[PDB]
Amino acid sequence: VHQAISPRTLNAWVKVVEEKAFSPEVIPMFSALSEGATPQDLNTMLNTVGGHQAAMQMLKETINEEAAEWDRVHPVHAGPIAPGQMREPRGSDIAGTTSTLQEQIGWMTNNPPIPVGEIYKRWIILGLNKIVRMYSPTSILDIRQGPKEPFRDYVDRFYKTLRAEQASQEVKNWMTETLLVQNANPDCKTILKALGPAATLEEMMTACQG
């Protein structure tokens, strides 16, 4: 018997995205809400998300990426001449873009079963992860210096992030003085350690400009 996604379940999803926006806590929700849903049902939820067109652009292309990938590892038989039982699900089919609700349900209840509903879901999750990333605050603790990156370039980036940080003036001090040195590559770090704990920024740059 077919039971489509309940309007209540679909409505809760709206309020979730409405409140939680795109914090990392949304994903767990999405999973709980989308448990056992068909590729069609998932799409309903996705299309139910108003606004946030930016994040959506990502989700979309991400879907397309995974779908295209699927076709490579599963080229089954393009053009099933002479009928048999049931055609194999292509990427676009899993995504539900080119598959009827019946076909989807069919693939899920066949021997062996092809859980297209779950497969598509996984792809959506990956897309959601990417979205959360671009929405997550820039942590200065991850700004390291590349082994070939000019010291000046590193400084520009380091300070840029600093300008966009929520921390007390005291903590910022530690970052400017100590941290900047800590994340420098082995060579520059070796030169900075020669100047001592109190060298000025200008001095450091002049020392590592080679």
Epitope: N173, T176, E177, I191, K193, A194, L195, G196, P197, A198, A199, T200, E202, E203, T206, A207
Partner: antibody, heavy 120, light 106 residues
């Protein structure tokens, strides 16, 4: 013309304190660090420590901890070195030097010196 | 930690003689600096990064060495070269050497 004009000679009671000065000129005070050196006859040249004009951070030589205290005044481009709990052992000439950064620190600029005499 | 011991402690050279003073560090150091000081005056930067001469320093001067042993040499000693020479750790904590008093042999 980068110049460092140090304060005059000092005379203070044993156990007291004193604060020397060094007025910098001809360069951006906050862009460089300021170091201090002690000179006693028979043990010439000992590094005391240095101050970062802008951040106000001071790093001292373990030996002179709880003895020396560096400060800087951006507005008057002057660095102050304060000595406390004086003994005849501290009577000496105190210099200040601003380095030039090349492959590392190069102490190219030194002050004329200030002779401190610990006596009552 | 690092201690710079210079030797000889005091020596007198005759005008024209080739002089060579050394500096021994307790542990390896990348570079070494050299300063010249005369009675009643601020020490003057003489040699940077082991062998680079400072401004106004006579060509007769030269430096060399690596790791734990460094040296300063005067090809032809001259009157104006009499003074005290100190060596210095190129990096923090910028420790100074014990010094060497160079005099004139008459």
């Amino acid at each position: 013309e980068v110049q460092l004009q140090q304060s005059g000679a000092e005379l203070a009671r044993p156990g007291a304190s004193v604060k020397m000065s060094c007025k910098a000129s001809g360069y951006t005070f906050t862009s460089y660090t300021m170091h201090w050196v002690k000179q006693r006859p028979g043990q010439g040249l000992e590094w005391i420590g240095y101050i970062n004009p802008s951040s106000g951070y001071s790093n001292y030589n373990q030996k002179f901890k709880d003895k020396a205290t560096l400060t800087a005044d951006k507005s008057s481009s002057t660095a102050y070195m304060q000595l406390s709990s004086l003994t005849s052992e501290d009577s000496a000439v105190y210099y200040c030097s601003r380095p030039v950064v090349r492959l590392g620190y190069n102490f190219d600029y030194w002050g004329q010196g200030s002779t401190l005499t610990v006596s009552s | 930690e690092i201690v710079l011991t210079q030797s000889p402690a005091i020596t007198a050279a005759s005008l024209g003689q080739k002089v060579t003073i050394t500096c021994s560090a307790s542990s390896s150091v990348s570079y070494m600096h050299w300063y010249q000081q005369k009675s009643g005056t601020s020490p003057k930067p003489w040699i940077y990064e082991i062998s680079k001469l400072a401004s106004g320093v006579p060509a007769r001067f030269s430096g060399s060495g690596s790791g734990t042993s460094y040296s300063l040499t005067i090809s032809s000693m001259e009157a104006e070269d009499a003074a005290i020479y100190y060596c210095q750790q190129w990096n923090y904590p910028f420790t100074f050497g014990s010094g060497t008093k160079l005099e004139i042999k008459r």
